[PDB]
Chain length 383, copies 4
């Protein structure tokens, strides 16, 4: 059974991502000073400005302009030549405090009883398609924009600009990868180099080194800067907003999604924490060998600590009747707001780093670790 | 095989939705004056302001303050008492023009060859779970917030405020719905009514009349304004942004998603047009009885007119080998940028109405129509 | 020799003044925490927002939103009914730090040598026309708006709104006041009261009690809310900006002005400190009886500690040849940046109070005191 | 009787002036399309943005971004190197419409009866110190910044940046100029040139060619970029705002001022039109030889067509008893709102040009013309 699946990714220089980075850059700074802070930060980015707003209630004292300018600076925009400049852009702020009405339902007398930051559903996912138990398409797309950024920073291709996007579509037969049909790579550049040169250079430096030569055949079709010109990019060519990369932030469209963004919010926000916890059990279940691939899904109710719903989907690839596989889940992990935070130790400034190139796949992240696997195994035919 | 699935929806009074409405309110206005306009409008909403920005290149002449004020006004916020007021709020604008670099790849000499507005992937979906071939969870959640809004406007529950959100989780056994385990309904209100009364009133007026009495049992759990207090809402309690309701806008998490928002963009933007066209064939395939449920997926490359990928997933529920089912797709429909726009006649101001309560399910929308079904049938065992 | 002279004033509810208040409100808060802070705060106010920006370099930690909301709150706008609301309006911030390039010229190794914050000229003034040695027209105009504000707060005229402006023109014959020809008083109000009533009420409560009955004759002409309707006011009816009440802030147009605003800046800013010091010597000279009225004028050069120009003008009313009168000035006072601040002890949070109803005329202000007079007398025919 | 008087000016690259230019640039554009438009445009400018706001009620259709970007572009900021860039900066808009409440008092049935845009007082001035009957100090200071700008644009001193300010103080003995004591000239520059070179260059190219060599003696003191470094300037180093150059816009502090700004407002605004009409009669009086120097002052009441106050001050230099000189004023000119506009034909886009380097002194401006002089002479001892 043959079929085609497509995924995509964006460079750290992409408007939307710039936002996320900024958003999560502020939270980290804040958290460093106060772990129990409540941060709901939304960032808007355009031509010559950066808007950092939302609701933040913390005892910490931070500098938004500095965190912002520095964050963009690192991204790469440092001259009007590229369209945006950390040093000369505007930095606006419209940050209020979190509504007490919401807060009474979140932070209650007893810390354990403390409730979900909001209502909603989240999807977790894992697959044995790769070592990091992540789907392949998203993994390679991420690698593509990441490479472009590194070949830019190291000065290999000095004419590359921050803004860039990547798309790849794999060939799936017998349910496994047989190759790659089409490759898309768009990257901002200087008025100094020509399309052909650029195209030819992108192949050698960015695509050829990242895509497995086996999956590349005379069939594969390459799309490099199709409009034929990408000199204008960044916020000037496209408005950047927080939480608009929901899918590339997760599993590339392979798995499902509930609609909750990650960047800008502290862990008491189930959108981010319950999501991480979901990748945590899903991955751990597959590592435990209880299934080849499984999608998990939890849903919550604001101010309520106990999950409103949970469901594990193994697409038949399970090895123990879902029954015990589902009774095992709530048995081993605590999906209650104030259970996942301890479970993954989320009270730390570790999110900025998570704002570009996927929230999953980086084994050093607390939710990528698989310690519960072997124990999740004991609970079912150890041996 | 039993399992639980959860979906959610938001009222037209929800911050994020306010943005979308505004965003799509501007495009419509513009389009009315110029159908071939290029509108990429992003809106940011908070406590006392509304930020309309992005890139717009049109020959039309519109008034952002008026479209905005009027759009919010209709939503409901017209007094400081509710936290936001169309008449007294601030209306900011940061709207530039579309980058010529992008444009050269979109609008080419030959209109047919005209390319995709951007790279990316989109997911279409259909299911025989309901008459409108839409999943059930998203359909009832939408109905819940929609009811709340109507009971508010008609004056049945005058103490209701615009801001509201709804969550419902269904019981799925044997792959069909058996009932509903938990119901969540959060709505903003006045300082005049008490929780109990409120709760009791929400049940009679909003939940009881909308949820099928069959699926409601003594088991069902109801979560009404859990924090115990929701008097503060709207942009004051939560920052609103365009395109952050990606999932409730589509299929509630039942189907997949690529990451493209809808509101604020003209049809030359595949994020909205290829998405619509995808719901179109998926629905049309099920209506054609070629499958009980199928997910479609297309992906594009900026400046390129021909789709980079297409894939139909029928989850085995297909009735004709996928083979002919996939060769039929590209046979009957034109997924090229300037083929879907004619296919669905997208050059009209018909989007604002699509900004609240789902983009799918409203049979009067051009993509909800199923005319190609019977003909899609002829191409496979007519009879 | 008869002639007419007109002056005007504005309520604390006037858009421009709102800005000022806000601007100086931020400074005070900062200064309280750090007296040697460098504050250059500019505020922009419109329909539903408040923009606090400029350059601030301090070690203090303050909350702009709180200071702002509270400052507007106190002014009076607390409902959408009045057009603006401290609780529901937007608060934006674009505050960067002071340029080091300016700083090196201001704060030098030796504190005494420390230079002027900028180049410019300032005008001081004093007149025996009144006990507080202030001109009369500006004194009564201030009193008018101040009364309206007090009759509003105390609940005497509950239908009065914050926004209001006052204009008075005196009759000057033989160089002295003989009466008042025309009176102007514009005040915002509620949709509840009628013009006539309002007008009739404004006379009894605000004008009649404030203007000396002697100067009021059957000739005087009263202009009360001329357009016939002033229900819409505040930032909604008129954009408020910092430093746009330069004249009512000083002497009502009777004396001269160099163009430097007061609110929003710390004392190292000669626009404010040299100005104050100028009223100080001019007042002190008249109190010392060396002249009936004299205008002083100093000018500075950025980064330069020693004044670029000084000139005393006594309009012939002097009693000691200007010569010794000018040599006495630089003899008694220190107009060097770091001499006037000590001279008047300006490193304290005492400016917000100065943001409405005149910077001069309040004898409790450090620059209104006349201690040097008697000593300024000894230096010239004591007896 | 010796004494010192100081005045100052600012380049078209000064933040405040940038605002004014922008503000008056929008009006002209509008007016070009609709002369009877009502424009009250206030601009705020900082680091990477430009805020155009206020209240505008016109039938005209204009592009703020374009007018703005182009206006800044012409000023000179076109690279992040200089701190601001017309191409890459942000352009924001908060423009509402004029309050109808104000309007009913302005535009009434009979166009003649039409009322003053607001209340307030304005000062006109003329002096025989120079051919254009302007005071000397302000004339030379303007020339200084204007020269710097020209030596920058023509490429003479390519390392000069737009931002610059100038200060000059004249020696006045026997009531006439004897020379100049101190000269101040601050200009932004590139990291490429040194202070000494710069200073030495500024003297040859900007000061020496502009200041009369007669007035320059070994006594004169020159202050050139005192802080020792001015590389950072423009909105980055200092916040720009509309109407904050009230004094350099007029007479340099030699004459009086009422507090009304010029830029951003249409002629129905007495702040600008009554101001111009006042320079018109004052200049015309001196030209008519009725006095060596005279200050005029009018005051108005909103919605009221007939001036609330008028007074002419000739400082004894009059040649006809003030009496007939004052009865002549209201005899010859019409200071009613709808009389001055026809008097000077103000319904035209001629203001941008007036936003930098003084509103008076340019004999080609309608208010600089002296046609009524000879006729103002006939009315008093013709011969
Ligand atoms: N290093 C520097 N050396 C000399 N002049 C400078 C330097 N940096 C900035 N300036 C100038 O300082 C100007 C200050 O203008 P000014 O408008 O008078 O300041 P202000 O505090 O805003 N006061 P005002 O508008 O008069 O109330 C800036 O706009 C620059 O032209
Ligand atoms: N209907 C009305 N009747 C009378 N006064 C009004 C009315 N509407 C508004 N006003 C007042 O008009 C004021 C105008 O202030 P003003 O600041 O002098 O205007 P401006 O054009 O901004 N000029 P300025 O700052 O002096 O250059 C407003 O802020 C209100 O206090
Ligand atoms: C829970 S809020 C987002 C979290 C918030 N930004 C914070 O600071 O934690 C998201 C949505 O919940 C709803 N909401 C706001 N206040 C609420 C309350 N007290 N109880 C229930 N729902 C509420 C609104 O519709 C709002 O858009
Ligand atoms: C195609 S743009 C969005 C469409 C745009 N708002 C418009 O007005 O049509 C989205 C992303 O594509 C990339 N992009 C911008 N200009 C491009 C170009 N000329 N060629 C290819 N990709 C480009 C950027 O990374 C940008 O964030
Ligand atoms: C010498 S420019 C005017 C003052 C400037 N705002 C500052 O920060 O000091
Ligand atoms: C009398 S308020 C000052 C003028 C106001 N901006 C207007 O729109 O006319
Ligand atoms: K966008
Ligand atoms: K939010
Ligand atoms: K104004
Ligand atoms: K400033
Ligand atoms: Mg985006
Ligand atoms: Mg959510
Ligand atoms: Mg949201
Ligand atoms: Mg996309
Ligand atoms: Mg004003
Ligand atoms: Mg100044
Ligand atoms: Mg200034
Ligand atoms: Mg005024």
């Amino acid at each position: 059974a043959k079929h085609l699946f497509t995924s995509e990714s964006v460079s750290e220089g992409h408007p939307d991502k710039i936002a996320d980075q900024i958003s999560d850059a502020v939270l980290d700074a804040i958290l460093e000073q106060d772990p129990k802070a409540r941060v709901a930060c939304e960032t808007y980015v355009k031509t010559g400005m950066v808007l950092v707003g939302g609701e933040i209630t913390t005892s910490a004292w931070v500098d938004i302009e500095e965190i912002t300018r520095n964050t963009v600076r690192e991204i790469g925009y440092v001259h009007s030549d590229m369209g945006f400049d950390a040093n000369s852009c505007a930095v606006l702020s419209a940050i209020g405090k979190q509504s007490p009405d919401i807060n009474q339902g979140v932070d209650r007398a007893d810390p354990l009883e403390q409730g979900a930051g909001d209502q909603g559903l989240m999807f977790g996912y894992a697959t044995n398609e790769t070592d990091v138990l992540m789907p392949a398409p998203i993994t390679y797309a991420h690698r593509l924009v990441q490479r472009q950024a590194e070949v830019r920073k190291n000065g290999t291709l000095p004419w590359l600009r921050p803004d860039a996007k990547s798309q790849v579509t794999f060939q799936y037969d017998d349910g496994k990868i047989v190759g790659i049909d089409a490759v898309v790579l768009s990257t901002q550049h200087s008025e100094e180099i020509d399309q052909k040169s650029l195209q030819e250079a992108v192949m050698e430096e960015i695509i050829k080194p990242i895509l497995p030569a086996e999956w590349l055949t005379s069939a594969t079709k390459f799309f490099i800067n199709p409009t034929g010109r990408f000199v204008i990019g960044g916020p000037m060519g496209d408005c950047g907003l927080t939480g608009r990369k929901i899918i590339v932030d997760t599993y590339g469209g392979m798995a499902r999604h509930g609609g909750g963004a990650f960047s800008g919010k502290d862990p008491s926000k189930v959108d981010r924490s319950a999501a991480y916890a979901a990748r945590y059990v899903a991955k751990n279940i597959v590592a435990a060998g209880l299934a080849d691939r499984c999608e998990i899904q939890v849903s919550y109710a604001i101010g309520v600590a106990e999950p409103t719903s949970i469901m594990v989907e193994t697409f038949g690839t399970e090895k123990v009747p879902s029954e015990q596989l589902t009774l095992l889940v709530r048995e081993f992990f605590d999906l209650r707001p104030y259970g996942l935070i301890q479970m993954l130790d989320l009270l730390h400034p570790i999110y900025k780093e998570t704002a570009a190139y996927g929230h999953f796949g980086r084994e050093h992240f607390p939710w990528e670790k698989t310690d519960k696997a072997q124990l999740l195994r004991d609970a079912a035919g150890l041996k």
